[PDB]
From a paper:
The ubiquitin E3 ligase cereblon (CRBN) is the target of therapeutic drugs thalidomide and lenalidomide and is recruited by most targeted protein degraders (PROTACs and molecular glues) in clinical development. CRBN consists of an unstructured N-terminal region and three folded domains: the Lon protease-like domain (Lon), the helical bundle (HB) which facilitates binding to the adaptor protein DDB1, and the thalidomide binding domain (TBD). We present the design of CRBNmidi, a construct that readily expresses from E. coli with high yields as soluble, stable protein without DDB1. Importantly, the stabilizing mutations introduced based on PROSS analysis proved to have beneficial effects, with the best-expressing construct (construct 8, hereafter referred to as CRBNmidi) incorporating 12 mutations.
Next, we successfully crystallized CRBNmidi protein and determined its crystal structure to a resolution of 3.11 Å. As with CRBNΔN:DDB1, the structure shows CRBNmidi co-purified with a Zn2+ ion bound to the zinc finger of the TBD. Interestingly, the protein in the structure is observed to adopt the closed conformation, despite the absence of a small-molecule ligand. The compact closed conformation was likely selected for by the crystallization process as, unlike for ligand-bound CRBNmidi which produces large numbers of hits, we only obtained a single crystal for apo CRBNmidi indicating that apo CRBNmidi is recalcitrant to crystallization in its flexible open conformation. In addition, as CRBNmidi is purified in the absence of DDB1, the additional stabilisation of the open confirmation through interactions between the sensor loop (residues 341–361) and DDB1(residues ~776–780) that was previously observed by Watson et al. cannot take place in this structure, and is likely a contributing factor to observing the closed state.
Author numbering: 72 to 187, 250 to 268, 271 to 317, 319 to 352, 354 to 425
Write the structure that this text describes.
């Protein structure tokens, strides 16, 4: 692993506008010949690329980000194209010192690794159990716990970065608890439609609270909630490439503005425990 305060050059996939956190999984599917070639060499060259926390995506302005290390690589060939699907985990946060694009179009970023309250954890843990009671997979260390919380939380991207700037685990834990106290989400374009609340979130899996899935190119972050409001389902369930196995999906849509706020999931077998659960896209929701 890269040393603290070091300065190295790490590739930037120009498509990603997600804000990754150390320990946050990123699913990627690459169709472009260049991006594919970059990952292949990178697979031999430490499998480490850069995920920037863009402030203004239009200008592509990010002051910091986190490193992502590839752990899965599978190659396919569809419609005459060579495609690559890779999975990578956040490893180390960094601060952007420089970023210039080489002649080949390969965007590289030179960055500096940023160096690495028990009752505050537990009190924060009690606040999470109030919204949903579950069985632990939650981490023991305070460092890891601050990151998992930052990833699995309905956070605005503005505040998502603000917790990456914090270099103290105890400070991350303290700032994160203040937000959980600060209640419900809403439709972005509307800003009036109230969709769900913190009491509805739950975890189908260990990383259940929030996780990411690829567009069968686009990468969505989907919040799992038990019930929802003010959203119309459209059509009938389909079992095609259900992001959650054994469930069928139907597109949800805002009643007022018709923005696609997510999907509604339904068990193909009565045996499954969360019979009714909703997947909601983070990009379509703004916290109140
Ligand atoms: Zn709306």
């Amino acid at each position: 692993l890269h040393d603290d305060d070091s300065i190295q050059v790490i590739p930037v996939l120009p498509q990603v506008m997600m804000i990754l956190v150390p320990g946050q999984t990123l699913p990627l599917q690459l169709f472009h010949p260049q991006e594919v070639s970059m990952v292949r060499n990178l697979i031999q060259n430490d499998r480490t690329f850069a995920v920037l926390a863009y402030s203004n995506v239009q200008e592509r302005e990010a002051e910091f980000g986190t490193t992502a290390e590839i752990y899965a690589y599978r190659e396919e060939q569809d419609f005459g194209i060579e495609i690559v699907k890779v999975k990578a985990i956040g490893r180390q946060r960094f601060k952007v010192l420089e970023l210039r694009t080489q002649s080949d179009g390969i965007q590289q970023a030179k960055v500096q690794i940023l160096p690495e309250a028990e009752t505050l954890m537990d009190r924060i843990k009690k606040q999470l159990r109030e919204w949903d009671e579950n069985l632990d997979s939650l981490p023991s260390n305070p460092i890891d716990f601050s990151y998992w919380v930052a990833a699995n939380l309905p956070i605005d991207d503005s505040l998502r970065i603000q917790l990456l700037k914090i270099d103290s685990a105890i400070q991350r834990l303290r700032c994160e608890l203040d937000i959980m106290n600060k209640t419900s989400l809403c439709c972005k374009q509307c800003q009036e439609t109230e969709i769900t609340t913190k009491n509805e979130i739950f975890s189908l899996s260990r990383e259940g609270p929030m996780a990411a899935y690829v567009n069968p190119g686009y990468v969505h972050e989907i919040l799992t909630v038990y019930k929802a409001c003010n959203l119309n389902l459209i059509g009938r369930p389909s079992t095609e490439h259900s992001w959650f196995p054994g469930y069928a999906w139907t597109v949800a849509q805002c009643k007022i503005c018709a923005s696609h706020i997510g999907w509604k999931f339904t068990a193909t077998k009565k045996d499954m425990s969360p019979q009714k659960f909703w997947g909601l896209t983070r990009s379509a929701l703004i916290p109140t």
